Design an enzyme around this catalytic site. Structure first.
Site, mmCIF file in Angstrom:
data_model
loop_
_atom_site.group_PDB
_atom_site.id
_atom_site.type_symbol
_atom_site.label_atom_id
_atom_site.label_comp_id
_atom_site.label_asym_id
_atom_site.label_seq_id
_atom_site.Cartn_x
_atom_site.Cartn_y
_atom_site.Cartn_z
ATOM 1 N N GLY A 371 9.651 3.922 2.928
ATOM 2 C CA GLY A 371 9.681 3.185 1.672
ATOM 3 C C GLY A 371 9.101 3.988 0.522
ATOM 4 O O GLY A 371 8.659 5.147 0.670
ATOM 5 N N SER A 372 9.013 3.320 -0.637
ATOM 6 C CA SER A 372 8.790 4.042 -1.880
ATOM 7 C C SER A 372 7.353 4.517 -2.034
ATOM 8 O O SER A 372 7.066 5.272 -2.967
ATOM 9 C CB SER A 372 9.210 3.181 -3.084
ATOM 10 O OG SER A 372 8.566 1.926 -3.047
ATOM 11 N N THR A 373 6.446 4.139 -1.134
ATOM 12 C CA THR A 373 5.201 4.887 -1.028
ATOM 13 C C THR A 373 5.459 6.393 -0.962
ATOM 14 O O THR A 373 4.637 7.181 -1.430
ATOM 15 C CB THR A 373 4.411 4.449 0.206
ATOM 16 O OG1 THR A 373 3.945 3.116 0.030
ATOM 17 C CG2 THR A 373 3.226 5.352 0.476
ATOM 18 N N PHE A 374 6.634 6.792 -0.484
ATOM 19 C CA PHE A 374 6.935 8.200 -0.180
ATOM 20 C C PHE A 374 7.155 9.038 -1.438
ATOM 21 O O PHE A 374 7.123 10.280 -1.358
ATOM 22 C CB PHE A 374 8.175 8.239 0.700
ATOM 23 C CG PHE A 374 8.353 9.521 1.499
ATOM 24 C CD1 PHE A 374 7.628 9.735 2.649
ATOM 25 C CD2 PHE A 374 9.292 10.462 1.107
ATOM 26 C CE1 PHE A 374 7.841 10.919 3.437
ATOM 27 C CE2 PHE A 374 9.488 11.652 1.872
ATOM 28 C CZ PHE A 374 8.754 11.853 3.020
ATOM 29 N N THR A 570 8.307 -0.361 -1.162
ATOM 30 C CA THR A 570 9.249 -1.219 -0.471
ATOM 31 C C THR A 570 10.370 -0.360 0.088
ATOM 32 O O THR A 570 10.679 0.718 -0.436
ATOM 33 C CB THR A 570 9.852 -2.290 -1.400
ATOM 34 O OG1 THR A 570 10.704 -1.637 -2.349
ATOM 35 C CG2 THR A 570 8.741 -3.061 -2.136
#
Length: 622
Positions: A371-374, A570
């Site tokens: 997810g967009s934590t990345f 997310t």
């Protein structure tokens, strides 16, 4: 002829504990036929084979031929399983009559004659404990409550039936189950007959306290620890050293460390003359107790992490990122391991298998799109190779963006509207469009070169089954959309929560990746220069703003008053969404957490559920 089936029916009945059926196949008692009456033969097997828990009687090279018109000869080799493990290369021989077996003492054990006896001494090995970083039990011996019945206190005739019926429907058993337990063979009137483990007694029902395997965190650490079950012949098939009546680990660490944990039970199985003087040693073992195994897990962190998931689908991994110790490995929903290990109804097992949320899966060991934590990894890579300038501002209008119409109906979506987006803004607001546009601007070659510095393809030195993390399915993306999607943690990325915590450890370690570790004494392992110090001093201050900025996606955690750097994210799957939180203490690097909600319900988030665990980790891991 028909004697090969007689010998086979005889061994088969012995192999199922039907000694009565074995006895009925024997010739009558005569000098040239059976040595004992059918009743004494039954008692012989019940006493000897029952006591040694003989199971798994398997025969081979069955040879039979005529000696007399009325008598055939048989011979065969056999192995069986006992309480002290497997006995093999047993040569059995005898004769048949007509067709029946001319029973002789050497059809119990091969060198037995006349009045020879069997002596068995056993010394229980203690299964080792699995314990946490401070010594608290995660898998241990517990005092358990055992339901049973005393047949002589059940009453007579119709009152017995009514008590057995009350017992069956007040402890969820079948009356038929109760009667087999009472019938069996070893039962006697004032014997306590065990029925079930339980966590108002009709007449004759009692509770005794018995030692058994016990899991103090129950469902909270069930996927990690696993459970033990009863050994079967297939297990002994695979491993001859296995005792026929022991326990074996069936999943998790109980199964990964079974050989270490189980030890070896001890004793002596031997043939003596009628006076007790040893004639032949069949098996001799010295007892060895199992080894205790000490984990990095913090039981209190484990329980907090699991509870905070509220029975929803997801996972939480906590670490001390400088040494890589795993403090919690939570997977939700879970199963009850104490019920798995004791009486487990097919009513409830299939209910666990039916569940579309699958409580059996180890989600901390399951690959997901991170997810967009990345974006914070893509940012680090682009700050290092120079493609991303933190002072550059992109113009982004609206909520949706697409490189051109070759993307079809696909568009990258962000959450809010600020139109002049630099790196810090992209991280605070979680702007996927910024990330997608950078990644396309980097290009696959620079992006993959940066990704190759982490742990994709690696098998981690962990006693937990898992697949290596992957960037994509093939060696190249072969799609601009896949490249863009990977930039903010979607696409064909697959990284399990432990792998994610490994990668994210670089922000607590000046750019060194520290490998996770679950065994407390194992040496810390690491990998230097995964991200440049440049990138790290830009990104950690921004991640502090994810919490401190009023519009930061984790601003609710600012009210806790504790030093935090964080990234929410997310992952969307064509309309199911996963929600992520990454957080650590950027003042002391004392702890790190990665938390996921799988298939999140509306208004739910990993962040909304993190506060209590962050307060515990902050207080205890500096």
């Amino acid at each position: 002829e028909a004697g090969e089936k007689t010998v086979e029916q005889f061994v088969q009945a012995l192999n199922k504990g039907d000694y009565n059926k074995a006895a009925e196949m024997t010739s009558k008692k005569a000098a040239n036929k059976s040595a004992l009456s059918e009743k004494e033969i039954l008692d012989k097997y019940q006493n000897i084979y029952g006591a040694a828990d003989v199971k798994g009687l398997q025969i081979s090279n069955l040879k039979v031929d005529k000696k007399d018109d009325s008598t055939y000869s048989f011979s065969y080799k056999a192995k069986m399983n006992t309480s002290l493990g497997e006995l093999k290369d047993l040569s059995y021989k005898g004769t048949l009559d007509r067709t029946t077996i001319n029973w002789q003492p050497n059809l119990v054990f091969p060198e037995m004659e006349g009045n020879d006896k069997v002596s068995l001494t056993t010394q229980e090995a203690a299964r080792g404990n699995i314990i946490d970083r401070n010594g608290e039990p995660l898998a241990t011996t517990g005092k358990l409550k055992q339901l049973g019945v005393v047949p002589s206190k059940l009453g007579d005739g119709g009152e017995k039936t009514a008590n057995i019926k009350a017992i069956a429907s007040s402890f969820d058993l079948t009356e038929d189950a109760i009667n087999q337990a009472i019938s069996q063979s070893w039962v006697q009137p004032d014997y306590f007959v065990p029925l079930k483990i339980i966590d108002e007694l009709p007449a004759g029902a009692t509770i005794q306290e018995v030692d058994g395997r016990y899991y103090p965190l129950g469902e909270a650490a069930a996927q990690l620890i696993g459970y033990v079950g009863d050994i079967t012949a297939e297990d002994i098939d695979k491993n001859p050293e296995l005792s026929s009546n022991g326990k074996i680990g069936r999943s998790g660490l109980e199964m990964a460390f079974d050989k270490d944990l189980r030890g070896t039970t001890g004793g002596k199985l031997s043939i003596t003359d009628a006076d007790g003087v040893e004639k032949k040693v069949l098996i001799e073992h010295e007892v060895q107790n199992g080894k205790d195994i000490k984990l990095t897990i913090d039981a209190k962190a484990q329980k907090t992490a699991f509870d905070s998931l509220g029975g929803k689908a997801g996972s939480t991994v906590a670490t001390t990122p400088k040494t890589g110790d795993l403090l919690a490995l939570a997977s939700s929903p879970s199963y009850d391991p104490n019920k798995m290990t004791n009486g487990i109804s097919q009513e409830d097992y299939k209910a666990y298998e039916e569940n579309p949320e699958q409580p059996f899966i180890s989600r901390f060991a399951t690959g997901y799109a991170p997810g967009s934590t990345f974006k914070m990894i893509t940012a680090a890579i682009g700050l290092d190779n120079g493609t991303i300038d933190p002072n550059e501002v992109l113009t982004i209008n609206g909520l949706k963006w697409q490189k051109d119409s070759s993307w079809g109906s696909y568009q990258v979506t962000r959450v809010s509207d600020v139109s002049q987006v630099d790196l810090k803004t992209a991280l605070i607001y979680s702007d996927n469009i910024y990330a997608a546009q950078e990644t396309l601007k980097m290009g696959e070659k620079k992006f993959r070169t940066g990704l190759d510095k982490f742990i994709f393809g690696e098998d981690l030195d962990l006693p937990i089954s898992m697949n290596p993390a992957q960037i994509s399915n093939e060696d190249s993306f072969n799609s601009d959309i896949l490249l863009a999607d990977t930039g903010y943690g979607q696409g064909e990325l697959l990284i399990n929560p432990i792998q994610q915590a490994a990668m994210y450890s670089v922000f607590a370690n000046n750019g060194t990746l520290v490998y996770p570790k679950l065994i407390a004494d194992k040496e810390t392992k690491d990998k230097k220069n995964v991200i440049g110090e440049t990138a790290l001093q830009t990104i950690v201050p921004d991640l502090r703003e994810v919490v401190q900025d009023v519009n930061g996606t984790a601003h609710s955690l600012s009210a806790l008053g504790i030093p935090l750097a964080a990234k929410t994210g997310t992952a969307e799957i064509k309309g199911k969404e996963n929600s992520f939180l990454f957080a650590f203490n950027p003042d002391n690097q004392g702890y790190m957490m990665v938390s996921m909600l799988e298939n999140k319900e509306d208004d739910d988030s990993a962040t909304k559920r993190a506060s209590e665990l962050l307060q515990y980790l902050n207080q205890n891991y500096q």
